[model samples]
Target: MKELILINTNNDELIKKIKKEVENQGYQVRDVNDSDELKKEMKKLAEEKNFEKILIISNDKQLLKEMLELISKLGYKVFLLLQDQDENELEEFKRKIESQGYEVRKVTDDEEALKIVREFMQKAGSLEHHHHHH
Candidate 1:
């Protein structure tokens, strides 16, 4: 069960660096530019693989909701990487995603983003091992 990190950010430089780090760590990374691309890939991924763990990195609220709906329907363990937003609705956004059965964590900087990725990857590794043993 390889973990797939679907990134939906518009920052190319940031994503490029993160992608390199994540791919180097042996996890699959896909750059989903937006919700539309996410939908398209969801169809293909659902048919082809059992990639159960996903991390969504985006600050767009509507896009996040759509992605959450798509992933939740497909039965994935969702993780959201949240950095600082100018709006006060950040708390509400977290609650909204959480209410939909997704995990949301605030990432203040690049270091924290990598930290969370490592954490999720470790959990995915353990879960994969769990299934393999049984």
Candidate 2:
């Protein structure tokens, strides 16, 4: 149950840090700075693998909503990490998605993001084990 996480970040420094962290966690990371390229990469990935989750790191509200709706409709769990530090906005976004019965999470720090990936992998592992046992 390997997870394929897509990271949308314009910050080079953060991108480097995230790529390194993702590799260390043994998860594949795809970086998309352009909207067009992001869609293309996502389509390719969806065709090639069953991604457990998609993570978008961006502050663009409209794009976030559009991607979230598309991915959720495709039966994939979606998460958004805003570039800003506004707790209100983050909470509101999370609330809105949860209201629609979707699983969503937000992270402001790299360490927190790492923890989210770790937990996701652990849960995925448990699910795989249960599936095989049954």
Candidate 3:
């Protein structure tokens, strides 16, 4: 088994993109940017268990935080995203940390974000790594 995908597919742009890349690759592409909507879908597919990956396109800190929070609510997908260092008053993102105590960062694009996320996850047993996933 590889992994599931939760993508933010908007407009007809990703329609073919998702069909060609997402579904072809065997992933459950999830839409909706709201927690309530996601929870609703979760209940609908409660019996099924395959969704596992989250590929987002957040260009800003606030947007990143929102998406991160949505994933955090899942309670099992705890992974760190390095957007900044400790000087940013780590606790300021109290709400984010409160739910999921993982480091988050702000990058330019999805590739960079995932790269940083991999870096954070690949490194372990020290302050450098903070992601814990199944």
Candidate 4:
């Protein structure tokens, strides 16, 4: 079974909603609300070398600046849930996350963001091609 680790660095409600939705899908789901907890999760993912699905909800662009290498080693499957609705950021999210040889996604709302997460869960074993960008 694939372990799903969700880290909410910015929003509370969004995380809560996603967590609930994911748990209902029948997977082992875990979450972090603070940076310390997030770091601990990364350490576990790094040490255990256990492949995991990750979702980081944040408005801070700097978070992914130095994380691509670490994430790539851990399986390069991440969902970058952003709070900002900026257009330029969209270009950057794709360029940085996807080009690193991993799959990544971005969203600006609760339900739609959950849709990406839910879709990833249901279609976890499929090819990473394209998305109906929300």
Ranking by lDDT: 1, 2, 4, 3
Off by over 4 Å in 1: 1-11, 50-59, 85-89, 126-134
TM for candidate 2 is: 0.65
Give stretches of model 3 more than 4 Å off: 1-25, 50-75, 80-100, 103-105, 114-134
TM-score ranking, high to low: 1, 2, 4, 3
Clashing pairs in 1: none
The candidate 3 region of ten consecutive residues with least summed lDDT is 1-10
- TM-score for each model: 0.72, 0.65, 0.39, 0.59
Candidate 2: stretches off by over 4 Å:
1-12, 50-59, 79-83, 126-134
Instruction: Give the per-residue Cα lDDT of candidate 1 at 7.
Output: 41
* Model 1 lDDT tens row, 44-117: 66776754444445546687677667765775555576545333455666777677766676544556766777
Question: 129, model 3: CA deviation in Å?
Answer: 16
**Which candidate achieves the best TM-score against the true structure?**
1
lDDT of each: 0.60, 0.56, 0.41, 0.54
Per-residue lDDT for 1-134 in model 4, tens only? 23332332355667677667766875545554444655576676656644545444443455454444555456544444443356566667667656665455555565676777777675666565446243
Q: Per-residue lDDT for 1-134 in model 3, tens only?
A: 11122332223443344344544444344554554565555444434555444333221344445545554554434343433234344345544555565544433334564444345323322442235442
Give me the overall lDDT of model 4. Answer: 0.54
